């Protein structure tokens, strides 16, 4: 999807970039926005709202949106119903930010960042978009979630390691 | 019914401490294999419904059904003391249904509450604790009761079971030796 969006951004009129940004930030499979934000067309000052959205979806949390809602189309999102798809994504991205800092996340911290009920909290963790993004074990008794371009680089390294691991397992089986 | 139901249930439990036979058991089996299941009309069907109700742990339903089977039958109306026996049977059925419940549901329940159970079966705790403890001790059930907090525990032992199996095997071997001789 990043490929398709970058190709479109680098062929379409600059007037189409705002809509492209709304499309990106609403897309069910997209969680990484750095490459799109870095596009020279993306960079331009005039699409200030678009730039703000990129900062918001590339770098910020749900809290950052709330802080800036009067200067971003939160109201427009409400009119549209676009935001909930966007709201969901920003909350998912917030979990990703938290997981980067710590591989054990207390429920109380998540709820504040989450701005959602603790009972609901697990459901939100439960939802599949979250599951693909994260693999973790919920500990109800301890009230925590154990969750073991820049990001892509790190991911790549992991993938390589993963492959090596799988190979080991396969090798063993082959032996038997 | 009163005699063979809890022992059946336990067998459903599979603890299999003891084997018991209950009259009209064959009739119940026939009904289960029946293509058609009607709401009870003949008396044996009312008794039947009371049995299944005991199995699922609705004692109120069971008590209701006996009258319903009975009313067409007029079976309980033929006794002068019928009220007395109605309440007496209501009590004995309360007890045995409590037993049956415990037998069937101990799989998914690791722990229990004697207060709640007492209220809901309409059986005072002195009866509850007694029945449960007695039964557990008699059937060698891996169940533990704290009288202080009034709570029960199950779902366990492995090591002991294996020990038993070993014994049995040894017995079989001995038998074979006899034939060999």
């Amino acid at each position: 999807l990043l490929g398709s969006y970058t190709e479109d951004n680098a062929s379409q009129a600059r007037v189409d970039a705002h809509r492209c940004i709304v499309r990106a930030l609403k897309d069910p499979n997209a969680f990484l926005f750095d490459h799109l934000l870095t596009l020279k067309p993306v960079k331009f000052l005039e699409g200030e709202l678009i730039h703000d959205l990129l900062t918001i979806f590339v770098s910020a949390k749900l809290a950052s949106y709330v802080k800036f809602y009067q200067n971003n189309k939160d109201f427009i999102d409400s009119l549209g119903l676009l935001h909930e798809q966007n709201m969901a994504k920003m909350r998912l991205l917030t979990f990703m930010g938290m997981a980067v800092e710590n591989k054990e996340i207390s429920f109380d911290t998540m709820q504040q960042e989450l701005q959602i009920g603790a009972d609901d909290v697990e459901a939100f963790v439960i939802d599949a978009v979250r599951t693909k993004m994260v693999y973790c074990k919920i500990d109800q008794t301890q009230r925590k979630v154990v969750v073991s371009x820049x990001x892509x680089x790190x991911x790549x390294x992991x993938x390589x390691x993963x492959x090596x691991x799988x190979x080991x397992x396969x090798x063993x089986x082959x032996x038997x | 019914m009163l005699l063979e139901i809890p022992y059946m249930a336990a067998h459903e439990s599979d603890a299999r401490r003891r084997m018991i036979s209950k009259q009209f058991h064959h009739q119940l089996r026939v009904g289960e294999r029946q293509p058609l299941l009607g709401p009870p009309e003949s008396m044996r069907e009312h008794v039947v419904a009371a049995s299944k109700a005991m199995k699922m742990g609705d004692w109120k339903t069971c008590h209701s059904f006996i009258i319903n089977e009975k009313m067409n039958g007029k079976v309980w109306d033929l006794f002068p003391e019928a009220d007395k026996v109605r309440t007496m049977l209501v009590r004995k059925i309360q007890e045995e249904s409590l037993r049956t419940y415990l037998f069937t549901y101990s799989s998914v329940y690791d722990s229990i509450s004697m207060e709640t159970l007492s209220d809901m079966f309409e059986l005072d705790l002195p009866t509850v604790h007694s029945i449960i403890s007695k039964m557990i001790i008699n059937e060698e059930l891996m169940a533990s009761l704290d009288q202080p907090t009034q709570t029960v525990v199950m779902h366990r032992x492995x090591x002991x079971x294996x020990x038993x199996x070993x014994x049995x095997x040894x017995x079989x071997x001995x038998x074979x030796x006899x034939x060999x001789x």
């Binding site: 397992x169 396969x170 089986x173 038997x176 | -």
Partner: protein, 170 residues
Amino acid sequence: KQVQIDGLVVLKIIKHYQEEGQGTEVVQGVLLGLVVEDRLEITNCFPFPQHTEDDADFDEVQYQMEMMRSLRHVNIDHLHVGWYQSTYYGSFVTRALLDSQFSYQHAIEESVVLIYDPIKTAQGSLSLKAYRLTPFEYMFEEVPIVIKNSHLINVLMWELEKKXXXXXXX
């Protein structure tokens, strides 16, 4: 591109072709398996009955449906990944065989045509090939076929002249 042929698939195709050869009537059947990546696994086959009709229209959809349903009660439950035939003419003698393949390709564009020669197949030489149609150009091309066998199958095969979880993980 590679067609991986299983032990039972290869033995059934050689057996059927040879049985067909005694008959003097050309033998065809269906190949069952999995399209994996580009590559295709042929895990099993079954024979189609001899028909008066030659080449296309040979297939009997009532026989096929019955056979497929009864196999499904059987474990394998594998897509039809193509067809095999034994055809004497070489090399690439007959136009008619290709059209059959076009019918298979229209049902599933990944379909493969295997051809085996039961007369020229001799100890040390199996004469077999696998084809697809091309998408002044030639109409078709051939992809080399490899054989897949499990360790259990290898041990089993070794009884001639004797003097599951793992597969899943893989």
